[PDB]
A paper describes a structure:
Two-dimensional image classification of the segments and Fourier–Bessel analysis of power spectra calculated from 2D class averages revealed a defined helical symmetry (rise 6.10 Å, turn 16.55 degrees, 21.75 units per turn, pitch 133.7 Å), cyclic symmetry (C5), and the polar nature of the capsid structure. In the cryo-EM map, the fold of the VP1 glycoprotein and the density for most of the large amino acid side-chains were resolved, allowing us to build a VP1 atomic model de novo and refine it. VP1 is almost entirely α-helical, consisting of two long α-helices (α1, residues 5–42; α2, residues 53–77) linked by a type 1 beta hairpin (residues 43–52), and flexible termini (N-term, residues 1–4; C-term, 78–81). Two adjacent prolines (Pro25 and Pro26) mediate a kink in α1, which facilitated initial assignment of the sequence to the density. α2 is also curved at Gly66, but to lesser extent than α1. The arrangement of the VP1 subunits in the capsid resembles the blades of an impeller, with the small size of the VP1 protein, and more specifically the curvature of the VP1 α-helices α1 and α2, allowing very compact packing of subunits. Each VP1 subunit makes extensive hydrophobic contacts to six other neighboring VP1 subunits, resulting in a large interface area of 2916 Å2 (55.5% of the total solvent accessible area of the subunit). A large number of aliphatic residues pack closely with each other, with Leu14, Leu21, Ala24, Met28, Ala31, and Val35 of α1 packing against Met61, Leu68, Val69, Leu73, and Ile76 of α2 to form a very tight hydrophobic interface. Our analysis suggests that this interface contributes to APBV1 stability at high temperature. VP1 is glycosylated, and sequence analysis using NetNGlyc13 revealed an N-linked glycosylation sequon (46-NST-50) located at the tip of the loop region. Although the density map does not direct assignment of the VP1–DNA contacts, or an unambiguous determination of the DNA conformation, it suggests that the DNA follows the positively charged helical tracks formed by the VP1 residues Lys9 and Arg79 exposed on the inner surface of the helical capsid.
The double-stranded, circular DNA genome of the virus (5.3 kbp) is among the smallest known dsDNA genomes. It encodes for the major capsid protein (MCP) VP1 (8.3 kDa) in addition to three minor capsid proteins VP2 (9.7 kDa), VP3 (11.2 kDa), and VP4 (21.4 kDa). To study the molecular basis of the extreme temperature resistance of APBV1, we have determined the three-dimensional structure of the purified APBV1 virion using electron cryomicroscopy (cryo-EM) to ~3-Å resolution.
Residue numbers in the entry:
A (entry chain A), B (entry chain A), C (entry chain A), D (entry chain A), E (entry chain A), F (entry chain A), ...: 10 to 79
């Protein structure tokens, strides 16, 4: 059972240095996520923000998940 | 029967050092779980909190579960 | 699991210097994306703009994606 | 049966001087396991830590394992 | 069994003077890993950084791996 | 195992004096990589630049690669 | 491995005095690459130009190539 | 049977004056087993150490081995 | 068996006065192992260094090797 | 075994007074290794330089090589 | 081994007074290497130049070559 167990543990241990990186990605990008037509520009910046947030909540699941079954 | 029995025992023995880790994950993440639009930010922090709590109650089941049948 | 894990990490790490380049491409092109018939010209410039923006939001997914399954 | 028996015994006898070494490896490495981007660095140090811990629990199995069947 | 056993041991013993070298390689290279177009340059430096980090975590596996089976 | 091990080590040791040379090649060439038609010339200079950058990231892999398997 | 290694190194070292020559060839030729029919002449001069440019980008590959495999 | 028997006996009798010598070799060498690049040197000294240790455990096998079959 | 046995012994006995010489060779050479193009020179000095180090670890094997089989 | 052994030793002993000579050859030649067409001359000088450098690294191999097998 | 060794040494020692001569030959000839048809003459002078340059690079090989094998 430890095969999955560690997979889970690792996934938990890896969540904060991944979500650390992840956020540096999304900030490094937010400048490049808005569509200017004339003068009025319209971002889709914080769409991609959410990508990260449910990715966040999601990883801490995967860990806790792979500890308890398929 | 001991094949499952130990699987259960292990799962109980492993519950507090897993929920130890787990919590360090969710705190290491709570900074990175909120979606700021203008100035007003809106977390989904404690959603992921719950992920852990029913994961908690859940593991102590799995242990006690694999001791008594499919 | 690290095989995919890194694939993900790399993909996140690579998102801002890719979206850096990408944007230099789309600006280097916007002059060459409009169809002049008589005198009235009609761009399709910012079509290609969007190409980049959902490409943007998309990469930060791929990273976070390859960390959690097929 | 002694063919496997000793394989097991050896594996047990070898567990503490292997996990002795192993740990010196993982400490000798933890300096070289973190990805600095600007100023903010983000380790994946203790991922590799776990590698050792379930490797640990795992070896003491292999010993006890090769004593009792395929 | 010692044939693999040592292969493993060696691999552990060799991990910190390899990851010592490895890092001197990646620093000796980071100057030569960025693509300047006009004035704005865009590195892919820390992509190659990660190459090393999962290489790191990976070696300490290989050691512990070749001790326990195919 | 040392047969591959050294191949790897060498490859790491050789990465910075190769990427040293490599860059002197690509600069010695960038003058000779642009196609002038009338007056307007159009380089493909920094295409060949990238050749080097993923060659870079690539070598530091090969080293770390030949240490761990086929 | 040095057999290929040097082949590569040489190829890099040889790229700028080859692309030096090469260009003197293509200029020495551009006078003799246009098909005059009546009065209107039509060159194919800069076709042969490109021959050199992708030859350029190509050599700096071959070098970096023969360092890393078949 | 004595043909192999003695081969074994000899091999046992020869193990401590061989491992006596062997160690004098590996110490006489450890000064000449480290790769200094700038100032930071990185040994591979104790790799070769292990060479001896599993050589050790190995000889005492060969003896006991050639007493009992192919 | 002594035919190989001595071959081994000799090889061990010969390792430190060979690696003594060897190193005097590689130092006597390191001045003559760097390729200067304009002003910037680029050594491949410590490539040849490694040649010696795995040669080192390798000899102490050959000795211990020729004591135990083909 | 000494037949090859000395061949090796000699080859090591001979490496620095050969690479001494060798370099005097390549300097005595570098004046006579460049192809001037009009006014612009283009050397292939440092091609031949490399000839020596991998010849260098190569000899110190041959020595260490002929000590350990075909 | 000295039979080839000297052949090599000699070949190195002989390279600069041969390439000394060689060049006096090719200059003594360059007047007599161009085909004049009407008034426009067309040399093949520097073809023969190259003959010497790769002859150059080539000799310094032969020396270093005959030191290390068939």
């Amino acid at each position: 059972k430890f095969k999955g167990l560690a997979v889970g543990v690792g996934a938990l241990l890896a969540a904060p240095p991944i979500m650390g990186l992840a956020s540096y990605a999304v900030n490094g990008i937010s400048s490049y996520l808005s569509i200017t037509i004339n003068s009025t520009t319209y971002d889709f910046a914080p769409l991609a923000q959410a990508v990260m947030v449910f990715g966040g909540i999601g990883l801490v699941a995967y860990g806790l998940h792979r500890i308890l079954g398929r």
